[PDB]
Amino acid sequence: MLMVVPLSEMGPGDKGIVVNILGGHNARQKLVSMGLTPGATIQVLESHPMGPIIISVGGVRFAIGKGLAGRVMVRKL
Amino acid sequence: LMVVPLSEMGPGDKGIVVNILNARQKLVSMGLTPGATIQVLESHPMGPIIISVGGVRFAIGKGLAGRVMVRKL
Amino acid sequence: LMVVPLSEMGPGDKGIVVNILGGHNARQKLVSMGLTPGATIQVLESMGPIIISVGGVRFAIGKGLAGRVMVRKL
Amino acid sequence: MVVPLSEMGPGDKGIVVNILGGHNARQKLVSMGLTPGATIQVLESHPMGPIIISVGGVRFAIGKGLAGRVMVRKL
Amino acid sequence: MVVPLSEMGPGDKGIVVNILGGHNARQKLVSMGLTPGATIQVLESHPMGPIIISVGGVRFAIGKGLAGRVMVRKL
Amino acid sequence: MLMVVPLSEMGPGDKGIVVNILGGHNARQKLVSMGLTPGATIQVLESHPMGPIIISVGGVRFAIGKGLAGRVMVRKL
Amino acid sequence: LMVVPLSEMGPGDKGIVVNILNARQKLVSMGLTPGATIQVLESHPMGPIIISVGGVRFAIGKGLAGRVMVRKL
Amino acid sequence: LMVVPLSEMGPGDKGIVVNILGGHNARQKLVSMGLTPGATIQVLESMGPIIISVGGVRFAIGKGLAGRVMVRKL
Numbered sequence: 001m002l003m004v005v006p007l008s009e010m011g012p013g014d015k016g017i018v019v020n021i022l023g024g025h026n027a028r029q030k031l032v033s034m035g036l037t038p039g040a041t042i043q044v045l046e047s048h049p050m051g052p053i054i055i056s057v058g059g060v061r062f063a064i065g066k067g068l069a070g071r072v073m074v075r076k077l
Numbered sequence: 078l079m080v081v082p083l084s085e086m087g088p089g090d091k092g093i094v095v096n097i098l099n100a101r102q103k104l105v106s107m108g109l110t111p112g113a114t115i116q117v118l119e120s121h122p123m124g125p126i127i128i129s130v131g132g133v134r135f136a137i138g139k140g141l142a143g144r145v146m147v148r149k150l
Numbered sequence: 151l152m153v154v155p156l157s158e159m160g161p162g163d164k165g166i167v168v169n170i171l172g173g174h175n176a177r178q179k180l181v182s183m184g185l186t187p188g189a190t191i192q193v194l195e196s197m198g199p200i201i202i203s204v205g206g207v208r209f210a211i212g213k214g215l216a217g218r219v220m221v222r223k224l
Numbered sequence: 225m226v227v228p229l230s231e232m233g234p235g236d237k238g239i240v241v242n243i244l245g246g247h248n249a250r251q252k253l254v255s256m257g258l259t260p261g262a263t264i265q266v267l268e269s270h271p272m273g274p275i276i277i278s279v280g281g282v283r284f285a286i287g288k289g290l291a292g293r294v295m296v297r298k299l
Numbered sequence: 300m301v302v303p304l305s306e307m308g309p310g311d312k313g314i315v316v317n318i319l320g321g322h323n324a325r326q327k328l329v330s331m332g333l334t335p336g337a338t339i340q341v342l343e344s345h346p347m348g349p350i351i352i353s354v355g356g357v358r359f360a361i362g363k364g365l366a367g368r369v370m371v372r373k374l
Numbered sequence: 375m376l377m378v379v380p381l382s383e384m385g386p387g388d389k390g391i392v393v394n395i396l397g398g399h400n401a402r403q404k405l406v407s408m409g410l411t412p413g414a415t416i417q418v419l420e421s422h423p424m425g426p427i428i429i430s431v432g433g434v435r436f437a438i439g440k441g442l443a444g445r446v447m448v449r450k451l
Numbered sequence: 452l453m454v455v456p457l458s459e460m461g462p463g464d465k466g467i468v469v470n471i472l473n474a475r476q477k478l479v480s481m482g483l484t485p486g487a488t489i490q491v492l493e494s495h496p497m498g499p500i501i502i503s504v505g506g507v508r509f510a511i512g513k514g515l516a517g518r519v520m521v522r523k524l
Numbered sequence: 525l526m527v528v529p530l531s532e533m534g535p536g537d538k539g540i541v542v543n544i545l546g547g548h549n550a551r552q553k554l555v556s557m558g559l560t561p562g563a564t565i566q567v568l569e570s571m572g573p574i575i576i577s578v579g580g581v582r583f584a585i586g587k588g589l590a591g592r593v594m595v596r597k598l
Binding site for chain 1: 078079080081082084085098122123139140143144146149
């Protein structure tokens with residue numbers, strides 16, 4: 001079982017590779033500015049019920065909302 | 078209620094500023110301080126985000142907006 | 151436990167903005183210092199203006215304009 | 225007669241007597257000549273800003289928030 | 300077949316494999332999607348720059364110097 | 375004897391108040407951006423033959439060339 | 452020869468970059484690194500300063516230029 | 525004690541740019557990495573590009589383009 005899950009479902013300590021961004025144009029532009037494009041590696045640093053999620057991409061930290069994070073499909077490493 | 082960065086909110090969305098993650102004065106002077114009520118009027122994905130705080134309209138860059146954590150109503 | 155105008159608050163007093171008096175021009179002037187309903191404000195000092203801190207940022211405000219800010223003291 | 229620069233109107237003149245804020249604020253303000261002892265005249269000011277000022281004969285636009293960091297003795 | 304992004308021509312595609320520089324450089328570059336594993340296509344590039352690139356379908360203009368910090372495996 | 379001298383002639387440790395900027399328009403605009411306008415206080419922090427001079431104005435440090443510094447007339451404190 | 456900040460040099464002036472007093476990459480990529488020869492073509496008091504380094508023309512902001520120490524020839 | 529193209533320099537080598545070969549386009553390409561006559565350059569490492577440091581800033585340069593930079597080794 002390969003684990004392919006939305007970034008919104010990943011928890012502190014998880015790492016993975018982005019495989020797909022859901023939602024075309026506006027979504028891609030909102031996400032690419034946090035380095036979230038296919039092939040980038042993400043580590044989840046912190047998360048709560050209610051968001052936000054704190055991630056690290058290429059050594060840079062970002063906060064992302066659970067909603068937008070649902071559009072990022074990640075294969076866990 | 079979800080907490081999201083201001084840059085991710087849509088037009089029409091309202092929220093309460095929770096916290097800011099140097100541009101501090103700049104942010105405070107657009108009303109963006111913990112407890113304030115904001116409404117997003119326009120987001121470009123893109124940027125700037127156009128918001129209203131306390132009935133006053135401001136345009137904020139997407140980079141800066143990404144550091145404002147907002148409790149979405 | 152009172153709501154008072156910011157103009158009446160003393161050094162060290164902390165409170166929550168609950169009401170801005172006096173129209174769009176007043177609101178436009180005050181939001182430059184973070185003063186909108188819900189914001190937390192501390193008076194640091196009061197012949198001169200009041201020195202306040204909002205969101206960790208220090209500003210000077212005249213007693214005239216500060217009289218338009220209703221604040222619930224904490 | 226000490227006022228925040230942000231509340232000075234068109235035509236008002238004064239001397240800067242105090243700057244609030246850290247190094248960051250002082251650096252921004254000194255780029256517009258705003259340091260203790262400098263003379264400032266407000267040229268145009270509306271609710272929303274920017275304020276148009278003149279310092280040492282040079283014109284600058286200052287935002288209303290940043291102007292709220294500057295205390296001036298009115299002349 | 301590893302090249303600096305700054306030397307890639309119009310039409311060249313590749314995968315970012317390394318970013319040079321400190322936190323500052325990484326932050327600027329991640330704002331344009333440039334992180335290890337990302338796919339980049341150069342759209343226009345002249346001596347002087349900026350280079351026009353596309354990452355994840357989004358277009359960006361990158362300066363020639365900053366592009367010299369990005370190593371890409373050409374495809 | 376009141377000491378009124380160009381900033382170019384002042385040495386590390388000197389403090390004074392700017393009294394006059396020589397040269398009208400272009401000079402004033404170049405200098406006001408370092409806080410050098412009449413009434414500002416300057417401290418000289420470092421100087422050499424050949425420049426530059428390092429000053430502090432309102433707690434902010436600037437380097438100025440000896441040539442431009444010749445246009446700043448200062449009353450020593 | 453005098454050492455002056457680049458922002459203070461006039462059109463026609465040439466110099467050698469001595470040293471820089473974060474924008475480091477930005478500066479290096481306009482050729483502004485110790486030992487380079489620069490010519491000032493235009494200064495606005497004002498800004499930007501227009502320079503030539505190694506035969507290539509750049510415009511640099513007055514703030515940034517004020518941190519480049521140049522040995523004036 | 526030689527002048528060599530940057531393309532021939534090894535890890536740790538330091539030198540002074542003395543000549544750029546190949547016209548305005550070459551010069552325009554190289555100045556983006558600080559490479560103009562007089563600049564000091566260090567080679568950090570050489571299937572891939574050369575990694576250099578100029579003015580404390582790290583860049584990658586292809587051996588093709590690096591062949592146009594004449595450098596007096598220190």
